[PDB]
């Protein structure tokens, strides 16, 4: 298996045939882990020699699957839910159970603090529309979403405030200051929100990032999201602005220390000093772990993001 | 000698004492080559053992100077210039003679073509003033000149059109497509224009580049400009906008293939589609070698520069 | 071979079959000369008898290929371009080498002088749009570009000032006043700018010229540009207005004596005597050989072009 963080994953099916030869990096086996099922890519090209794995198998990590050729709280409220009407006791899927356990751990073990803010993105939206036009009449086949600008702004903010690109230990006594900047971006698949991770966001440009995002969003909404494309995230951006919620307080995505939720952009009046100009404010909200970061550092971080997205030219400085 | 392109340079004086110990990278010896006299830096720290070089010596390359411890055209018009008045036959300095020979070679051997253009830099100037304010009230001690934005725009244009980051041979039959992007920026010292080279402009940010430029401009205007800080340039930017010349046609700086001259920014009316808005147009002029580049490629290059400087946000894409 | 100016051209391939019979004037053989590869047309119709030429042959002029049936300057700067980064020493194609040699001869042997000018073409553009509409609803399948009006204006100017329709000798002592008016128009093929020549521009109308131009532009951009369609030019029009460069100084296309570069039309304010009316100015630039023409004659020529294109009705006078 090329890259699983160390969880025992149960196979669902395989992609190959006895005698088939596989391309450079394409699907061979789907395995149903956490978040969503992942398709192992190919390491190289070659015809099949081993069905060392089959349909229904299970691998924890680095197993040869293919050879080729080339205190005392009250209990939950016991209620007879059927005495008031008709019920239907559905049972949560395994990914739903796992996500619930992960969130119930992050809620207890992380002291959350949520700073809300609003970013004037009128210029950013005008520029994004202009670049979506220019990238059309030049036949690039790329769509620049408002999320890649936020990824760049958050990468800049992690460059300036490296305390936010950290992670605590089990006991919460040793920090892990990361020097790389990967950012997960919560994509909405029919099976809930999955977080694919984009690597080295601080270096890549907005068009390369936009191509990566346009690819991986579809890769997730289809279910073919490959492992390693959901591991090693330093930060999370949960954008639900396409649906509403003028603000919301997300949950920190352990083992990270912060998460930026993005809301629906709205045209609001802004005081220019003498009158109310109609600008387009985007409500962001930084929910962070209070053990690593304090209120002032969260304030400086979200105001760095606000300044960067307010005038995107600050990404070249 | 740490880095001379292979020219025999004559020493002027030394910077050290018998027994003195020198710092990491500071002056040891000044040598009067082409363009301007260069101060050899230190390779390391250590007390003096050899005055292997002295005052008045001459080195062509890699000489141990210190050991430490730790067809038929008409002739020129023969005129008796004194029969009309009083004259004074001054003789050109050695750097003036060398620069004249270099320019008289570049004029003959290079077919120049000069494309003029005007760039709407109203937004760029507003943003530069805003960042000069913000970099003051935050005590950065940096001054962001309009030239670093042009360096970034030219680096972007060399990324997009790599044919401009080239160099021809003696016979003009083999090109040398360079992959690095260094840009010389003509600084005006009391001894004329010297071109110091800034390396990897495509990667560095505008504030790092602005610090480099603020340092090396003074380093040149004082004369302490070190070698290697004037070698390996892929492009040249000759900015004379501080003096006038609404346009000018520079001479290609061999062995490069192009040079961008910059003129004085002026507030001109621009057709927005229905009226004349007063914008701030900066006149640029790309003078390039016709043997490598043709008129259409020069047009695309200067319009890439014009688009980048017109909306600097295109540096993040 | 029907028409090569006297250069030894190397064959690339043939267009026919043993037994095939060829039409009136269509492709038989492609030969890779200067500027671009040319397809020899047919002189007549008839079935094949000789493969007197083959694939890879070479002809200098009039060879039977088919029978049918029916002082001391400094050297170039020696730089080790790899000590600053990674390079890639590509070698120029044969057409690039030839064009570089031609331009490096024209630069030395021709004293260039470039007169810039701006032409009010508001009426001309309105009339061209009107005729493009009228030539559509009448099903002519012709597109009238702004370049045919410039060809007509330059033909008129060559009629009025016949000194510009000239050519010098090797020694530059005997002029050759041409009486015909052919005009090359620099078309932009993927292999650079090629100049196809349109004959007797002074007589043909704008719709016939527009059909010729629409045909030969595609003929060049595809590579099927036939010889004789790039020979015998009295003048050159290099139009790069589709790309930018508000002005540019082209290189005289020897053995001609002048060249008109055309830039991007822009809406500028023009003094009507009492106010600034927004007109559409087209920046032209006449670069001419100073040995034949002087500054005043160039001024009169470019002002004739400016007057003609300013009010195109002067083409009937």
Numbering used by the authors:
A (entry chain C), B (entry chain E), C (entry chain D): 211 to 280, 384 to 630
Task: Quote the original article.
The pyruvate dehydrogenase complex (PDHc) links glycolysis to the citric acid cycle by converting pyruvate into acetyl-coenzyme A. PDHc encompasses three enzymatically active subunits, namely pyruvate dehydrogenase, dihydrolipoyl transacetylase, and dihydrolipoyl dehydrogenase.
We report here the cryo-EM reconstruction of the cubic E2p core of E. coli PDHc in a native resting state (in the absence of substrates), in which a lipoyl domain is bound to the catalytic domain of each E2p and the dihydrolipoyllysine residue is immerged deep in the E2p active site channel (coenzyme A is not present). The interface area is 840 Å2, includes 24 pairs of interfacing residues, and is stabilized mostly by hydrophobic interactions, but also by polar interactions including hydrogen bonds and salt bridges. The lipoyl domain interacts with the catalytic domain through a striking electrostatic network. The lipoyl domain exhibits a large acidic patch that interacts with the positive dipole of the N-terminus of the catalytic domain helix H1 as well as with an arginine residue (R407) on the N-terminal tip of this helix. Specifically, two loops (residues 213–215 and 242–249) of the lipoyl domain form several hydrogen bonds with a loop of the catalytic domain (residues 536–544) located along the entrance into the active channel, and there is also a van der Waals interaction between methionine M248 from the lipoyl domain and methionine M543 from the catalytic domain. The dihydrolipoyllysine (K245) itself forms predominantly hydrophobic interactions with residues of the channel leading into the catalytic site, which is formed at the interface between two catalytic domains, and both thiol groups are engaged in polar interactions. In our structure the reactive terminal sulfur (S8) of the dihydrolipoamide, which normally carries the acetyl group, is oriented towards a nitrogen atom (NE2) of the catalytic histidine H603′ and is in a close proximity to S551 and D607′.
